[PDB]
Amino acid sequence: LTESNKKFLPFQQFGRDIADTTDAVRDPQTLEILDITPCSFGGVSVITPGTNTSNQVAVLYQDVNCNVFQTRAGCLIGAEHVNNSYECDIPIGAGICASYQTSQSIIAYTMSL
Amino acid sequence: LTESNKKFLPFQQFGRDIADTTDAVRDPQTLEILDITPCSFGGVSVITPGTNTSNQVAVLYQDVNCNVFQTRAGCLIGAEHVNNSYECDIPIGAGICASYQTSQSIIAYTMSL
Amino acid sequence: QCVNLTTRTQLPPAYTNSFTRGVYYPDKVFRSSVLHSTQDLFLPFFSNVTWFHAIHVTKRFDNPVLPFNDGVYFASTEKSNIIRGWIFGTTLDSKTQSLLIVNNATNVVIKVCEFQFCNDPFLGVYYHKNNKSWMESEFRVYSSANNCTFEYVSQPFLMDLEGKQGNFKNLREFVFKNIDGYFKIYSKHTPINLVRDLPQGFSALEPLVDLPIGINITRFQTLLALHRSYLTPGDSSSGWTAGAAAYYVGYLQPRTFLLKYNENGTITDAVDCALDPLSETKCTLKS
Amino acid sequence: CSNLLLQYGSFCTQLNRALTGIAVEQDKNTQEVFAQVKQIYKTPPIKDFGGFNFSQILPDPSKPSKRSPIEDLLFNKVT
Amino acid sequence: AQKFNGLTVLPPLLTDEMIAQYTSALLAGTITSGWTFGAGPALQ
Amino acid sequence: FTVEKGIYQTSNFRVQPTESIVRFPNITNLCPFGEVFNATRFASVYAWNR
Amino acid sequence: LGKLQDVVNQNAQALNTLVKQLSSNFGAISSVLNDILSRLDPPEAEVQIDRLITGRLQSLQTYVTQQLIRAAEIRASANLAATKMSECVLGQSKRVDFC
Amino acid sequence: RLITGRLQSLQTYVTQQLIRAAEIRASANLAATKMSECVLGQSKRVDFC
Ligand SMILES: *[C@@H]1O[C@H](CO)[C@@H](O[C@@H]2O[C@H](CO)[C@@H](O)[C@H](O)[C@H]2NC(C)=O)[C@H](O)[C@H]1NC(C)=O
Ligand SMILES: *[C@@H]1O[C@H](CO)[C@@H](O)[C@H](O)[C@H]1NC(C)=O
Ligand SMILES: *[C@@H]1O[C@H](CO)[C@@H](O)[C@H](O)[C@H]1NC(C)=O
Ligand SMILES: *[C@@H]1O[C@H](CO)[C@@H](O)[C@H](O)[C@H]1NC(C)=O
Ligand SMILES: *[C@@H]1O[C@H](CO)[C@@H](O)[C@H](O)[C@H]1NC(C)=O
Ligand SMILES: *[C@@H]1O[C@H](CO)[C@@H](O)[C@H](O)[C@H]1NC(C)=O
Ligand SMILES: *[C@@H]1O[C@H](CO)[C@@H](O)[C@H](O)[C@H]1NC(C)=O
Ligand SMILES: *[C@@H]1O[C@H](CO)[C@@H](O)[C@H](O)[C@H]1NC(C)=O
Ligand SMILES: *[C@@H]1O[C@H](CO)[C@@H](O)[C@H](O)[C@H]1NC(C)=O
Ligand SMILES: *[C@@H]1O[C@H](CO)[C@@H](O)[C@H](O)[C@H]1NC(C)=O
Ligand SMILES: *[C@@H]1O[C@H](CO)[C@@H](O)[C@H](O)[C@H]1NC(C)=O
Ligand SMILES: *[C@@H]1O[C@H](CO)[C@@H](O)[C@H](O)[C@H]1NC(C)=O
């Protein structure tokens, strides 16, 4: 229930959108306009270096907002972020991939074209 | 109920496969392992020379195992087999076609490339 | 009949970790070269499992009435057959059908009845003077019994009644389940040379007997056997000896398991789906 | 079960015809790719092509199969 | 939006900046080398 | 009424079984009843074994 | 080989899914149609039979649609391969970065 | 019946998206050929570029 910036006419109780979903309801306690947004977004994904290469994995959340790196394609945990760029093999989305390099651990970086 | 060559652990009665179908049941008579295979396979088919050319036909079964010629693509009856090869017109399968040649009857042969 | 014990210094129970243990056949069908996943109560891998001691050197003897959840895992690194059997029930006051699965020196005895169960039943072994053999004489498991229906004997099972203090040489695992009132037994003897920290090797459990009882259950407790040699005065108050043994009790939870069936037809691996993200990835791809 | 299937026999007719069309389309795909020429040309017995070694793509008579060593390596690679 | 009912939209692997970079690289190759860069090393 | 050259699928072939076997065991168990006849001695007619 | 392996694995998994569809009840009280006939009378068990018919019809229709789309993709790839054969194999093609 | 209706709607949407994806794949193949021919060289195909 976020703080909205749009006011209603003084005769309405609900509020819908273009997609016809009730996402705005006036609070009867103090006539406060509050927005509605669902919490569960997307699923989970697992980054695996492969068989006979490593054993540890990295878990990627699709559209969930949060070692731990907040990428543009959700939340990525279990893979450290490094500023340099190499050629990427395991795609993730939004221009950043993940790989297993140098011990050695799973890293995430912006791909090189 | 064919005679299998795989032994069962002495606590099991049923048996399945990769495709999850019960195809091996242990017979409780004297502990014999017997496989299960369906007896009905595929359908029937007909070879017709066409109109204004002939009146007889040749019945072909898709995969049923048996004048009568045992082809690779099932059982073909009503069409004699000849060792020579010409260009083929009516396809049957597995490199063998059928045609109406020299009286004259329906013949089956390996196609020529 | 039964007698009461005397208060003494005991040892608190410890907690240990399982290593790919508690895997049995979930059905009675034959599967070869297929990775089949089933929903059934198993023991989760790498879970903190309870540990109970049975060694003398001190005077450790603990037999709590643990609650019987939906399936239990009972593993013992038995060496000299110190443990005897198990008892079951809800209140143990001759009001319900209490089980008694014991293994005497001549034959296994399974009889669920309404035995007048005491506070701490046990098996007593006495060392004869003229005879150099350990023989069981104190058969104090219950006070009396009234009525029951089921009784099973099976084939005779021979065990050794002599207790030692050396290292263990065998490992026995048991799984007890109750689905729709049907009692399930899964066991397999496995040789090993270790004292603790159960190996990471894999071994499935095959059913032995499948009891159609259909009764009520919620609690369980194990039975132990102590020795009465010439060193101890022979009274069950403060002086006794129990040899050396250790049994593990684990509780089964409903998790999907991906089994590895080889070309022979036995389970080889039991990769999970709710333990590790890598295991979930393995079991979602069925590979 | 068959008695209630007369109410949906047309659906099974469409499904069977679609599968037959798919099968004959798969059959016609091989004729459009490999049957480009209507004359089978034999490889000459002379293997002196100015130094170009063609044994890895031409069939070899050492094996009963007509596949090339590249094709035999290709057949076993896929399942 | 269209995401409130579980209809999540997957972001593309390549952003618009990377596509623009690819187009600029192709443009530079086709004005500075012609077709040599498309069939081998780039020749001035 | 006119059929051209080619393959045609008309119907299906099903091999209907003609015999059925439903025997579950190889033999059933017994109970001790031969001692009624295989006995050292029998009873009389005024007081017979039941 | 990636291209040659997908066309076999997809068909095999579609066949496996078709087999798996017969293990579901589609909201009925049983999966196998023989069990309901043996345990219930045909006048009463007609609705369960019809529900199973509708479920199997839906699964078969989805399989047919998937196979038709796969066949269209295979037809496009076969046309591309035939053109590649007739251009790069049966002669020399002037199209740059095509062969 | 709600399950069946939602399943039917989802299946129809998936079929429409698959057909659209096939058309997009054909268009992308055409665009790739155009990029390889008209851009990465000079194409002798008349009325193609
Ligand atoms: C063409 O290449 C093949 C490679 O397969 C050559 O065959 C090899 O020849 C060497 C030299 O004697 C042998 O040691 C290898 O065992 C051969 N391999 C096979 C698979 O046959 C062949 O000699 C070459 N021919 C020409 C004319 O260059
Ligand atoms: C994620 O949440 C944190 C704290 O709740 C917030 O500071 C951050 O702006 C959020 N990220 C986005 C993209 O809104
Ligand atoms: C490298 O990454 C760190 C991470 O915060 C950043 O502060 C730094 O500016 C980066 N350096 C370069 C050259 O990108
Ligand atoms: C078949 O029956 C006989 C009794 O006539 C029995 O002895 C034998 O063990 C049986 N065979 C089995 C159970 O395999
Ligand atoms: C067909 O059946 C005959 C006799 O039943 C048998 O000899 C033959 O091997 C069978 N063919 C095949 C391909 O199994
Ligand atoms: C065809 O000719 C070959 C020549 O050896 C012979 O072996 C074969 O039996 C002949 N087939 C028929 C059907 O005459
Ligand atoms: C040991 O067991 C307890 C209770 O089951 C649990 O809370 C604890 O996390 C376990 N220890 C470890 C290291 O997981
Ligand atoms: C062993 O105990 C059982 C009861 O559990 C009893 O029936 C049997 O007679 C005992 N054996 C001996 C040798 O006393
Ligand atoms: C045994 O006796 C009790 C009476 O205390 C009775 O409630 C119970 O039903 C009896 N059990 C059987 C199997 O008859
Ligand atoms: C079995 O026990 C449960 C509670 O544990 C009780 O609700 C149920 O009525 C009992 N059933 C019988 C047959 O005693
Ligand atoms: C299982 O059977 C196969 C085939 O007989 C054999 O090769 C394999 O060794 C057997 N496995 C075991 C553990 O005996
Ligand atoms: C009685 O004994 C005879 C011989 O000992 C034996 O053949 C027979 O089967 C037994 N039983 C009956 C019912 O006659």
Distances (CA, A) of G97 to C77, C185, H21: 70, 68, 25
Q: How many CB pairs under 8 A join G and H?
A: 33
Four-point Cα dihedral G82, G87, G88, G89, nearest 10: 70
Q: F44 C-alpha to center of ligand 12: Å? A: 21
Q: C216 C-alpha to center of ligand 10: Å? A: 6
What is d(CA C222, CA C66) in angstroms, rounded to the nearest whole number?
A: 9
Give the resolution value in Å.
3.4
E39 and H CB contact within 8 Å: yes
Q: How many CB pairs under 8 A join D and G?
A: 51
Of B45, B50, B64, the CB nearest to F5: B50
Tokens representing G19 are: 């087999």
Contact G23 B19 (CB under 8 A): no
Side-chain half-sphere exposure of H6, counting CA atoms within 13 A = 3
Q: Which residue of chain D comes nearest to B95, CA vs CA?
A: D27
Task: Please give the biggest Cα pair distance in chain B.
Answer: 67
What is d(CA B55, CA B66) in angstroms, rounded to the nearest whole number?
A: 25
Tell me which amino acid residue B4 is. Answer: S
CB D15 within 8 A of CB G64: yes
* Distance, C-alpha E21 to centroid of its chain: 6
Judging contact as 3 or more Cβ pairs under 8 Å, the answer for C and H is no
CB of residue C146 inside a 6 A radius of ligand 9: yes
Tokens representing G86 are: 């007739």
Q: B83 C-alpha to center of ligand 6: Å? A: 6
| DSSP assignment of chain C | -------------EEEE-SS-----SSS----S---EEEEEEPPTT-EEEEEE------------EE--SSEEEEE--SS--EEEEEEESS-SSSS-B-EEEE-SS-EEE--B-----SS-EEEEEE-SSS-SEEEEEEES-S--------B--S----------S---EEEEEEEEEETTEEEEEEEEEE---SSS--S-----EEEEEEE------EEEEEEEEEE-SSS-S-TTT--B--S-EEEEEE-EEEEEEEEE-SSS-EEEEEESSS-HHHHHHHHTT-
Side-chain half-sphere exposure of D10, counting CA atoms within 13 A = 1
CB C101 within 8 A of CB C211: no
Tokens representing G45 are: 């068990």
Contact E38 H40 (CB under 8 A): yes
Tabulate helix, strand, coil % of chain A (nearest 5).
Answer: 0, 40, 60
Residues 6-25 of H with CB under 8 A from G: 7, 11, 15, 18-19, 22, 25
CB B72 within 8 A of CB B88: no
- Nearest alpha carbon, ligand 10 atom 7: C216
Closest by CA position to C16, among listed C248, C201, C270, C176 = C248
Contact A59 C277 (CB under 8 A): yes
What is d(CA A23, CA A36) in angstroms, rounded to the nearest whole number?
A: 4
- Solving technique for this entry? cryo-EM
Q: Which residue of chain C comes nearest to A50, CA vs CA?
A: C278
What is d(CA F26, CA B29) in angstroms, rounded to the nearest whole number?
A: 5
Distances (CA, A) of D46 to C61, D41, D50, F22: 92, 14, 11, 70
Q: Classify A45 as helix, strand or coil.
A: strand
Residues in chain A, total: 113
Q: A67 C-alpha to center of ligand 3: Å? A: 16
* Distance, C-alpha F26 to centroid of its chain: 10
